[PDB]
Design an enzyme around this catalytic site. Structure first.
Site, PDB file in Angstrom:
ATOM      1  N   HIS A 180      -6.697   7.159  -2.642  1.00 21.33           N
ATOM      2  CA  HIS A 180      -7.535   6.125  -2.040  1.00 21.33           C
ATOM      3  C   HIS A 180      -6.826   5.333  -0.948  1.00 21.33           C
ATOM      4  O   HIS A 180      -7.499   4.656  -0.162  1.00 21.33           O
ATOM      5  CB  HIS A 180      -8.049   5.169  -3.120  1.00 21.33           C
ATOM      6  CG  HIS A 180      -7.150   4.001  -3.375  1.00 21.33           C
ATOM      7  ND1 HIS A 180      -6.094   4.052  -4.259  1.00 21.33           N
ATOM      8  CD2 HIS A 180      -7.157   2.744  -2.870  1.00 21.33           C
ATOM      9  CE1 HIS A 180      -5.484   2.881  -4.281  1.00 21.33           C
ATOM     10  NE2 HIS A 180      -6.110   2.069  -3.448  1.00 21.33           N
ATOM     11  N   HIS A 234       0.827  -1.206   0.000  1.00 15.60           N
ATOM     12  CA  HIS A 234       0.000   0.000   0.000  1.00 15.60           C
ATOM     13  C   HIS A 234       0.866   1.263   0.000  1.00 15.60           C
ATOM     14  O   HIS A 234       0.836   2.083   0.918  1.00 15.60           O
ATOM     15  CB  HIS A 234      -0.948  -0.021   1.192  1.00 15.60           C
ATOM     16  CG  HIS A 234      -1.930  -1.150   1.162  1.00 15.60           C
ATOM     17  ND1 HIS A 234      -1.710  -2.345   1.814  1.00 15.60           N
ATOM     18  CD2 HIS A 234      -3.136  -1.268   0.558  1.00 15.60           C
ATOM     19  CE1 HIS A 234      -2.738  -3.150   1.611  1.00 15.60           C
ATOM     20  NE2 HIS A 234      -3.617  -2.521   0.854  1.00 15.60           N
ATOM     21  N   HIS A 238       1.325   1.390  -5.690  1.00 15.62           N
ATOM     22  CA  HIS A 238      -0.043   0.883  -5.743  1.00 15.62           C
ATOM     23  C   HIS A 238      -1.021   1.987  -6.122  1.00 15.62           C
ATOM     24  O   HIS A 238      -1.965   1.756  -6.887  1.00 15.62           O
ATOM     25  CB  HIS A 238      -0.422   0.265  -4.397  1.00 15.62           C
ATOM     26  CG  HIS A 238      -1.871  -0.091  -4.275  1.00 15.62           C
ATOM     27  ND1 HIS A 238      -2.457  -1.091  -5.021  1.00 15.62           N
ATOM     28  CD2 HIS A 238      -2.850   0.415  -3.488  1.00 15.62           C
ATOM     29  CE1 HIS A 238      -3.736  -1.184  -4.700  1.00 15.62           C
ATOM     30  NE2 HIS A 238      -4.000  -0.281  -3.773  1.00 15.62           N
ATOM     31  N   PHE A 251      -8.220 -16.313  -3.577  1.00 11.90           N
ATOM     32  CA  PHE A 251      -8.501 -14.891  -3.746  1.00 11.90           C
ATOM     33  C   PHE A 251      -9.143 -14.617  -5.100  1.00 11.90           C
ATOM     34  O   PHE A 251     -10.056 -13.789  -5.206  1.00 11.90           O
ATOM     35  CB  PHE A 251      -7.212 -14.085  -3.584  1.00 11.90           C
ATOM     36  CG  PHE A 251      -7.411 -12.598  -3.635  1.00 11.90           C
ATOM     37  CD1 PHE A 251      -8.411 -11.992  -2.893  1.00 11.90           C
ATOM     38  CD2 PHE A 251      -6.588 -11.804  -4.416  1.00 11.90           C
ATOM     39  CE1 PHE A 251      -8.592 -10.621  -2.937  1.00 11.90           C
ATOM     40  CE2 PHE A 251      -6.762 -10.433  -4.463  1.00 11.90           C
ATOM     41  CZ  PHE A 251      -7.765  -9.842  -3.723  1.00 11.90           C
TER      42      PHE A 251
END
Ligand SMILES: CCOc1ccc(Cc2nccc3cc(OCC)c(OCC)cc23)cc1OCC
Ligand SMILES: CCOc1ccc(Cc2nccc3cc(OCC)c(OCC)cc23)cc1OCC
Ligand SMILES: [Mg+2]
Ligand SMILES: [Mg+2]
Ligand SMILES: [Zn+2]
Ligand SMILES: [Zn+2]
Lengths: 321, 326
Positions: free
Chosen positions: B115, B75, B79, B287
């Site tokens: 985000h 993160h 990303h 996933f």
């Protein structure tokens, strides 16, 4: 004084407590003395191993974080919602809630408006406030009330939930959050519509029967919401005092809006406002539809309160020429 | 300046799925979010449409990129740049031509950039279970996503950082609400509900005379933008394998470090975070099978057949990770 207070507190289970006298009789500490007496009345200190002292030290720092220079959303309002939720819990049509569910509804009532600056959510959003920037315009005040209320528990000898189990602490925190977030007035219609479908699907013995968490937390949400909007249902001498305080706060916000050139939100103009017609409209569209739906859920336990509400609506209408 | 010419050549692929985002991060001196956002804003003529000063845009982009943690494996600013570029490609899909306004396009791209800003590298549940200050502030409700929004908006107030300074107040008000609605939808706890609404839209979708999607209300328009950024957030298994495997190594590194912090606290180790007994390959297959493929298959149905090559790459990568298990 201390024994005038003592006998004033004797009606904590009565709809119409002299909260304003108790406030001045207690040295401007009504939230502390009412929360205490309620905890002793419901036997919550022993049921949750709450040291009496730690309960005092937290209720005092919680009360200090209520602004004294705000007319309505202060410690007296917090004390009034606490006592009223305590009465609505003792409604015969509902020990439907557990001991933790009772403690959550009472604790949420005490913190539901802490650190209130005397302005609305829309004011904080339109002014680009730090609070609205922090909480992304969504229930800005209510999120702040919760955060401050929980953070004060971490102060010196104020964790009144110190001897609760971890699963009880998380269940209480979740319920307190769900309750205080429901005090957002922007969620009143959805909270009332869901209350109207509950009474349309009500299942009673006639004590009411709730089985799942979403139905029980929904009643607790509407309960504290009812006590938050319980001013027009109390005796007239109490109702009129709350009206003067909320209009003083609306005018102060209307003064702050006009000295910035922002729109004067309704019921906030100093020089253009009808206090009495607004109270009648506030009852006809918000308070009475909510309290009549709540009356049908505990029918007929809320008949007296609905009568007092209709009485005050008739009186305020009579004050209009 | 030969390193600037290689970077400009790599930036020519910003309209293409599978951009070499890790090379662009290297060629731009650990500034992928800045150069990719700057390239996209020029490509969509956003600087001229909204009167954005070029110096103001670069100043905010560098400040926003600075607040992504460089010491977190997944993160991070790479990303963010990856999600920005993948939202940019998804916006250009034929089934959405001239469907969204310039303000909605600006909102979706801006939301993609902020985000995950100031992501500490741990999940919402970790922040809740550890009684973090962030979880206390946001009352355990979308803790990270609310924090990303607050930081992304706050940085606009720094010196020469308000890239929306020339928008009308109605434009800023509309953009702020759309950005909030989009970033809050990146909370993985809302994935099932967001996918359920996306499936309902696919089953009842209406197209126009030109063949593009008909979205005549804010609820439908913001729902498409929410799922678009959500798909871009979960776009790693749909990229070429050499990019997918790098994202997998980075998220497992972040998971293992959280489990180590979970171990040093006596907490129960979260799933897929125990670096002593974890299966990277089996977790990626699960996933994809339970989250990524159901989401991307639904989005592919929404813009059929514009996303077929992306869906084929995802199913190819799923087969490959599966083949490494026996
Ligand atoms: C459409 C009208 O709805 C509302 C209007 C105003 C408010 C604001 C509001 N918040 C909290 C307590 C209030 C107590 C009051 O009186 C006490 C006698 C009061 O008196 C208005 C005439 C307004 C009050 C809340 C509303 O609830 C829905 C948003
Ligand atoms: C309902 C939401 O579900 C989930 C939500 C979040 C997560 C964990 C998670 N969070 C964010 C990004 C992720 C990227 C990953 O890979 C990229 C190659 C990844 O790879 C599995 C180890 C898990 C990821 C896992 C979930 O599902 C587990 C059943
Ligand atoms: Mg309030
Ligand atoms: Mg995120
Ligand atoms: Zn209140
Ligand atoms: Zn992300």
């Amino acid at each position: 004084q201390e024994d005038v207070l003592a006998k004033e507190l004797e009606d904590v289970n009565k709809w119409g407590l002299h909260v304003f006298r108790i406030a001045e009789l207690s040295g401007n500490r009504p939230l502390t003395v009412i929360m205490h007496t309620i905890f002793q009345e419901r036997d919550l200190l022993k049921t949750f191993k709450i040291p009496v002292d730690t309960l005092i030290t937290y209720l005092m720092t919680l009360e200090d974080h209520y602004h004294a220079d705000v007319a309505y959303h202060n410690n007296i309002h917090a004390a009034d919602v606490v006592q009223s939720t305590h009465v609505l819990l003792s409604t015969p049509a509902l020990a439907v809630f557990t001991d933790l569910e009772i403690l959550a509804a009472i604790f949420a009532s005490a913190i539901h408006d802490v650190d209130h600056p005397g302005v609305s959510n829309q004011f904080l959003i339109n002014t680009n406030s730090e609070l609205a920037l922090m909480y992304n315009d969504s229930s800005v005040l209510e999120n702040h009330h919760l955060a401050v209320g929980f953070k004060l528990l971490q102060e010196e000898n104020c964790d009144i939930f110190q001897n609760l189990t971890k699963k009880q602490r998380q269940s209480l925190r979740k319920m307190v959050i769900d309750i205080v977030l429901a005090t957002d007035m922007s969620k009143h219609m959805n909270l009332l519509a869901d209350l109207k479908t509950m009474v349309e699907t009500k299942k009673v013995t006639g004590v009411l029967l709730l089985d799942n968490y979403s139905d029980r937390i929904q009643v607790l949400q509407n309960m504290v919401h009812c006590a938050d909007l319980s001013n027009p249902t109390k005796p007239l001498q109490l109702y009129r005092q709350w009206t003067d305080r909320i209009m003083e706060e609306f005018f102060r916000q209307g003064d702050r809006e006009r000295e910035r050139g922002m729109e004067i939100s309704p019921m906030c103009d100093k020089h253009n406002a009808s206090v009495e017609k607004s109270q009648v409209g506030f009852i006809d569209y918000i308070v009475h539809p909510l309290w009549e739906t709540w009356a049908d859920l505990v029918h007929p336990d809320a008949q007296d309160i609905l009568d007092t509400l209709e009485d005050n609506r008739e009186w305020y209408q009579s004050t209009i020429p």
